[PDB]
Every structure is written in C-alpha cells, then in structure tokens.
Amino acid sequence: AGVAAARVNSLFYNARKKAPAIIFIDEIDAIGRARSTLGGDPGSMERESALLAMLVQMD
Amino acid sequence: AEGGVRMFTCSGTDFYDVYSGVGARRVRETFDRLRNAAPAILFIDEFD
Numbered sequence: 544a545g546v547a548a549a550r551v552n553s554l555f556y557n558a559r560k561k562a563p564a565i566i567f568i569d570e571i572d573a574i575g576r577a578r579s580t581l582g583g584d585p586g587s588m589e590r591e592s593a594l595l596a597m598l599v600q601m602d
Numbered sequence: 603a604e605g606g607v608r609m610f611t612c613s614g615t616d617f618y619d620v621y622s623g624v625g626a627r628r629v630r631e632t633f634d635r636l637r638n639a640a641p642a643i644l645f646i647d648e649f650d
Contacts, residue, residue: 545620592620599615 544585547574547593555600607641614648 558564568574574593612632617625636642 548620588620595615595618599613602613602615 544589545592547589548596551593551596551600605643607643608639609645610636610639610642611645612647614646614650 554566558566574590574597576590576594578591578594579587610632617628632644636644
C-alpha cells in the first residue's frame with residue numbers, strides 16, 4: 544500500500560523538474576476508473592490513492 | 603470583495619489524502635486560523 548501514489552509522485556516530480564515535457568499514461572482505464580460505491584479492497588484502496596494523487600498532481 | 607472580508611480557500615483533495623489521523627489536526631488548525639483571523643469565509647471546492 545502507498546506504492547501507487549508514491550510512483551505517481553515520483554513520475555510527476557521528475558517530469559516537472561524537466562519542463563517542458565510530455566507524459567503518456569496508456570490505458571488509464573485501470574487508474575482513472577470511476578470510484579465505485581462499495582468494495583472493500585486494498586487494490587481498491589490503492590486505486591483511490593493513485594487516482595486522487597493523479598488528480599492533485601495535475602492540480 | 604463587496605463584503606470586505608479576507609478569503610481563505612482549500613480543495614477536496616489535499617484533505618482526503620489517506621495518511622491516517624492527519625485530517626483531524628488539519629481541520630483543527632485551519633479552523634483555529636479562521637477563528638483568530640475572523641471575520642473570513644472559507645471556500646472549499648468539491649466538498650463531496
């Protein structure tokens with residue numbers, strides 16, 4: 544746990560350090576998938592954390 | 603502006619991070635800052 548958000552952080556950090564740049568996240572279907580209503584999954588937890596980290600990083 | 607008051611703002615993301623236990627101190631501190639800086643209006647986007 545905490546691995547996906549940290550990887551997104553590392554990627555966006557080394558990107559913003561080298562601006563201007565381009566990022567290409569192929570098949571975002573596994574990261575930007577809609578937040579479900581239920582499902583107690585640590586993979587769901589990591590998806591939520593990666594999703595909001597992505598969101599705040601492009602913020 | 604027309605009310606003539608200091609404006610504080612936030613977002614739904616920085617607070618809903620999953621680092622456990624951090625939210626309580628965060629909201630405590632931001633509200634105490636509002637109180638000691640009042641009057642003021644806290645705008646917060648995507649509250650949901």
